[PDB]
Enzyme design. Structure first.
Site, PDB file in Angstrom:
ATOM      1  N   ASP C 294       0.459  -1.007   0.374  1.00 34.74           N
ATOM      2  CA  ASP C 294      -0.070   0.203   0.144  1.00 34.74           C
ATOM      3  C   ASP C 294       0.721   1.275  -0.294  1.00 34.74           C
ATOM      4  O   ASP C 294       1.746   1.362   0.354  1.00 34.74           O
ATOM      5  CB  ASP C 294      -1.053   0.236   1.268  1.00 34.74           C
ATOM      6  N   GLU C 330      -0.480  -0.654  -4.748  1.00 32.48           N
ATOM      7  CA  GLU C 330      -2.225   0.990  -4.372  1.00 32.48           C
ATOM      8  C   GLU C 330      -0.418   1.808  -4.928  1.00 32.48           C
ATOM      9  O   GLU C 330      -0.192   2.036  -4.089  1.00 32.48           O
ATOM     10  CB  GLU C 330      -2.401   1.070  -3.579  1.00 32.48           C
TER      11      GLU C 330
END
Lengths: 297, 599, 593
Positions: C294, C330
């Site tokens: 992330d 991400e």
């Protein structure tokens, strides 16, 4: 039979009811449901029986329903409820019955009765029908059970046929059709005597798997049942005869709403002893599934 | 190295079924080897005269799997010995669980029972019998069991029983004249309280001292075998005796106990391999060292439950599996008071693996029916007739055990209704029907005279009644029934095929007609359960021609009125009972007629 | 002896990707071995109940590359231990960075967490799943990822999460029934503050104690595998947690830190092994199928080449040792080639979260259906950016939290309309090119935002609308896993049909692989349309294979029941057209018979 104890009036009437029926219509059929363990319901009066041809195996029904109502994690602890059903399967001529009385009065649909989410519920219902067609005895299924309808049977309405649009239930109906076709065509399933059944293995209590044989004369059908959602790989099952075996039915086939897991046929018995048998099959057991296998001719 | 490493490896497996070869006390001319299982022990020591009962003299060395062993020079046969086990702060003296003989030092079993070093050397002369024993093949041969408690059977003087040897010739003499096939002995394993009848067991590997040495017992069995009689030993794997020095808290903690309502905390922990060795080895011990032909397990239901106990169920299944492997012609019989299926069925079919089951259902129905008056038996006809619905569910033995003639239940004689003649008639009728009914036969001692009193173990049976007519007649009836049993194979096959109904719906006159068959042979049984003679009573039969009267309960030789067909009965070709030919007979009062076609 | 020369010099070199095999507490039956990386430490001691916490009983000896190691007789599994490290004048008590399991001594983690000696022995039964699992090849297969936070999913009793083993059967049953291919778990590595959701991590090698043992996690992953389910683990290499007793100023100096304050110094070789061993540690010891990094953006920009070269070597190392694993990123700055191979100058991920699609799809659907004509391009223009990367369409926990609102809350109008919009949004996402990720609770259209201290509003599964939405997703996954036209997310596999109906806010496109074709017609207006003509390439009989508006899902039941026949006159530049009735706020999927 009882007043509470024996009513001889009723017992003699019952006996002469059956005698006149078969005397005047030798090809009629008479069936009885008795909630006691009264002996010889299915026996001829001249042998001191009540003279019915068939008796509902309500013992089987309660036993089976009690077992699969329970969760697979727990099925370990109730394995004996499943296997001991056959100690009582040859006491009378029996019709394995799931009825309207079972799917009423807060007892819940057969579908409702089964554990887990809808996929597993549908899987279990395919298993129940799978074993009932495998278990010795004639078969009775009440309307609407064949697709696994949700709601209890309500006489003031018509069955939830709309569920035949959803896949899970259309798959169950297909499974029953295939089961009945197998039953109608294979004589190994016609003979419900003890000769018609042989145990293959019953003591895999941990993994909740049972293997048995339905055999008439030379013909034989192998039933391997996994009562757990984990599939099992390289599971070996003893066989009487060695050679190519075909998989005639797979509850987990995609057509019934399943994983699509299976042996895929061309199973060659391995000339290794297993389960006290000369040869053995190395099988893959799909989740919550029933396999029915035939040797190849 | 007293113990093989295989032995320790087999002990941990629970596969040591010859464990008696190494555990317990094993004599050598110089000294005795000692071996005891005590896993939670910090130390174990042998105490005896051979060391002034000193605990530091001979401390066994711990081997693998909580197996302790040691050698003691000068420890001799016939000496008493004892184990001292130390559990941390506390130590305690214990008896040997594998003791081969015990004797009371005070002289009273209830005060002290002491393990005694023993040699089991005995030369057998029973070669011929054991090369021909059957058992599993006995399913199709006559098995007529005489159930016996040795101390209660006969006395040399009031309160003094026969030795193992002294009993041999009288019991063998009696059993042969009777025609009985086996003797089932109420438990012989060492027990403190005589009033227990032996079911509270302390020395599983030791025959009770009361009747002699271990060899004395081997001689008895050896003798009976030469006389062609079988020996069944009652065995108690369900529970052990509550004796503090006994199996209870052996190593200072739970060992043989679970780490039942009937006997809580005295139940064997079938989970432990060490328990499983001890129990199954002992089963084999009796079949091996004492040549016993059969073993009877009581209160099997107490093991099955607590709901089912699977520890025990796998144990029972492995017990039966092991016995028939090492002794292919042994017999195991079970008494199970619930409707547990497949007791007599093989383990490979999910059965418990027994050869025989006591038909306690039959006994209850039968006794309840005959407790009833013939005037009233009309209203209970189904209790009599329905025994045959459940008569083939297992390989069964019809049973009339000691448990039925105790605790105010009344002697079989006392149970039968009416005056003395009818009481004698009823019992002769009862046995006749029991011998006809499918299944093997078991009768507890004293039933053969129809003795008045309940079985009192503290005394000897009322043999004086054998002088009086009614009781001598019943003894003659049982002998003659036993002759019919062995002579005719129609009774050997207790299968559904063996039995066919002739008539069962005469409720008013309380009569039963049935057929017992093997191939050519037929035996026709007609039973009148009311004191009223029946004349012109027709009974359908398959075959025409001359029929013979093989036995009549009402013969005056048995104490009967003597109404009879006395043979020379000719079938009439008129359909009766849905059968081609019929017999026109006289039914004697409260009697059984047994008839076969003349040949 | 605890350390080979090849270990020390692999450590120095930034290449010891087995470092977990030697670093941390390694139990032996007599005693536990201890190894710690503390280059600027003058002294290091292991403390524990096994030596009365004596800072001098057992002081690890110094080996090369700043590694310390010592063996303590009497230190056994389950014994809590601690590192007392001395730097010049000052000493400090510290966690094991390589601790394999941790536990809170007070029963409250915010106060505690201590390292625990642990044996990682486990016997697996997932062999079949792992010789069949498909990593990079999964580009041409259905990937339906159900995003899960274990604690918030279900509770055995209120305020109590399911155990690892306890959750195994309910989660598999659910995932199977709804037809998702994988589960993505918010980070399970140890974290003090439960409220972080796991992204502030103390023990990168320890599964969070809250759900059980390290072996418990293995059983669950083992269990899910046999039921044919994949497990993706969230991984936080961008930053470590602000724990004084943990990675912060570890040896006494900056160590894991940069020589704000808690981003890993990728320049250091020691940090590189720690993380890259941690990537393989989960793929290896816990049989993890996928890692999900992330906020790759924060790793990328300050450009941080030390971090970009680390991210490239991270992916390279993973696929070298695990060819059929999956790495998902991400990234929020539209960095090019995230899902591209390093040899094409890419970051090396297999997948990238299409958060571009997520914003467009969310923004378009909060607009009232009336206004949707005026933002037609926002909807239709998603396919101009749909093939830049291997994309996973994503609905996440971040989306349903902090006033963003639940997807049901986001949907406009009355509850029936909101349910219809949610079904249309789910239908479009499956139709739209790219893999699908759906976070727990969206499947039955739950009412509030995700609340991590509670269990999902499963009671809402009695209302008709929500039971239906769950039924819509199951069937969506059922068609997805069956029809390969949806397996291929390349520009090939998508074909437009009509994007010009702005006034009635209708969209028609085609999803195809080889011969197979799927027709998607979407009506984003509560007004129904009948006699709607949709161009088709093929003629003949056409079947309707899914309909949002079916009653089983909670719709009015407007559909094209009878097998749709094709009329052979040109429409939408296509030879044939299907006259169709479009249900309000619904998507129709049509397959040629």
């Amino acid at each position: 039979l009882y007043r509470d104890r024996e009513n001889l009036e009723a017992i003699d009437f019952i006996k002469k009811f059956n005698e006149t029926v078969y005397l005047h219509f030798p090809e009629a059929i008479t069936i009885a449901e008795e909630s006691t363990a009264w002996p010889g319901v299915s026996a001829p009066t001249y042998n001191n029986g009540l003279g019915f041809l068939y008796k509902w195996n309500m013992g089987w029904m309660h036993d089976t329903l009690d077992y699969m109502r329970r969760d697979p994690v727990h099925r370990k602890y109730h394995h004996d409820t499943l296997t001991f059903s056959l100690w009582y399967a040859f006491s009378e001529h029996y019709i394995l019955p799931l009825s309207h009385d079972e799917v009423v009065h807060g007892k819940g649909s057969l579908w409702t009765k089964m554990p887990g989410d809808d996929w597993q519920k549908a899987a279990n219902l395919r298993l129940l029908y799978g074993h009932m067609w495998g278990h010795p005895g004639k078969k009775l299924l009440f309307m609407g059970g064949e697709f696994g309808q949700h709601h209890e049977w309500n006489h003031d309405t018509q069955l939830e046929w709309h569920l035949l649009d959803q896949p899970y239930h259309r798959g169950i109906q297909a499974w029953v059709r295939d089961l009945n076709h197998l039953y109608r065509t294979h004589p190994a399933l016609w003979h419900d005597g003890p000769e018609g059944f042989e145990w293959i293995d019953f003591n895999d209590r941990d993994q909740s798997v049972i293997c048995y044989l339905r055999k008439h004369t030379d013909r034989l059908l192998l039933f391997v049942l996994n009562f757990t959602p984990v599939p099992r790989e390289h599971y070996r099952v003893g066989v009487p005869i060695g050679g190519p075996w075909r998989e005639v039915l797979n509850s987990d086939a995609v057509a019934y709403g399943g994983s699509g897991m299976g042996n895929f046929g061309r199973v060659e018995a391995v000339p290794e002893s297993w389960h006290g048998r000369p040869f053995h099959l190395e099988l893959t057991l799909p989740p919550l599934a029933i396999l029915i296998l035939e040797p190849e001719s | 190295s007293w113990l093989t490493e295989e032995d320790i490896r087999r002990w941990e497996s629970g596969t040591f079924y010859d464990s008696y070869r190494k555990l317990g006390a094993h004599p050598d001319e110089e000294g005795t080897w000692f071996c005891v299982w005590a896993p939670h022990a910090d130390a174990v020591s042998v105490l005896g005269a051979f060391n002034n009962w000193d605990p530091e003299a001979h401390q066994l060395e711990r081997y693998g799997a909580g197996l302790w062993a040691g050698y003691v020079p000068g420890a001799l046969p016939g000496h008493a010995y004892k184990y001292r086990i130390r559990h941390g702060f506390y130590q305690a003296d214990k008896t040997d669980p594998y003791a081969f003989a015990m004797e009371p030092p005070t002289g009273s079993p209830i005060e002290g029972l002491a393990s005694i070093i023993t040699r089991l050397d005995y030369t057998w002369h029973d070669d011929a019998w054991m090369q021909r024993r059957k058992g599993p093949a006995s399913l199709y041969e006559p098995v007529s069991i005489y159930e016996v408690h040795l101390g209660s059977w006969r006395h040399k003087q009031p309160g003094v029983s026969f030795s193992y040897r002294e009993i041999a010739e009288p019991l063998a003499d009696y059993v042969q004249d009777l025609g009985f096939t086996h003797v089932e002995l109420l438990p012989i394993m060492e027990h403190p309280y005589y009033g227990s009848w032996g079911y509270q067991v302390v020395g599983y590997y030791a025959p009770t001292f009361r009747y002699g040495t271990p060899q004395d017992l081997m001689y008895l069995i050896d003798y009976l075998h030469q006389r062609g009689i079988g020996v069944i030993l009652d065995w108690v794997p369900s529970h052990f005796a509550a004796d503090p020095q006994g199996l209870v808290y052996f190593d200072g903690t739970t060992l043989f106990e679970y780490d039942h309502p009937d006997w809580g905390t005295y139940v064997f922990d079938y989970n432990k391999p060490g328990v499983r060795n001890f129990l199954i080895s002992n089963a084999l011990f009796w079949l091996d060292y004492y040549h016993v032909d059969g073993l009877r397990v009581d209160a099997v239901a107490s093991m099955l439950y607590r709901r089912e106990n699977l520890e025990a169920i796998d144990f029972i299944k492995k017990f039966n599996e092991t016995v028939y492997l090492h002794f292919p012609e042994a017999i195991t019989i079970a008494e199970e008071s619930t409707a547990w299926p497949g007791v007599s069925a093989p383990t490979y079919n999910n059965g418990l693996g027994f050869l025989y089951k006591w038909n306690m259902g039959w006994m209850h129905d039968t006794l309840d029916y005959m407790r009833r008056d013939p005037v009233h038996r009309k209203y209970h006809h189904d209790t009599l007739t329905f025994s045959l619905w459940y008569a083939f569910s297992e390989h069964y033995i019809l049973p009339l055990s000691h448990d039925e003639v105790v605790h105010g239940k009344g002697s079989l004689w006392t149970k039968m209704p009416g005056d003395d003649w009818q009481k004698a008639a009823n019992l002769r009728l009862l046995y006749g029907h029991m011998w006809g009914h499918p299944g093997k036969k078991l009768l507890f001692m004293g039933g053969e005279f129809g003795q008045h009193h309940e079985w009192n173990h503290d005394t000897q049976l009322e043999w004086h009644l054998l002088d009086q007519p009614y009781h001598r007649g019943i003894q003659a009836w049982v002998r003659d029934l036993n002759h019919l049993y062995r002579t005719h194979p129609a009774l050997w096959h207790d299968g559904p095929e063996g039995f066919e109904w002739i008539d069962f719906n005469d409720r008013d006159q309380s009569v039963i007609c049935y057929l017992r068959k093997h191939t050519d042979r037929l035996l026709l049984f007609v039973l009148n359960f009311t004191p009223v003679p029946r004349e012109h009573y027709r009974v359908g039969v398959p075959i025409g021609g001359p029929w013979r009267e093989v036995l009549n309960s009402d013969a005056v030789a048995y104490g009967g009125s003597g109404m009879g067909n006395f043979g020379r009965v000719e079938a009439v070709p008129e359909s009766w009972h849905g059968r081609p030919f019929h017999l026109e007979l006289t039914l004697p009062p409260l009697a059984i007629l047994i008839l076969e076609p003349e040949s």
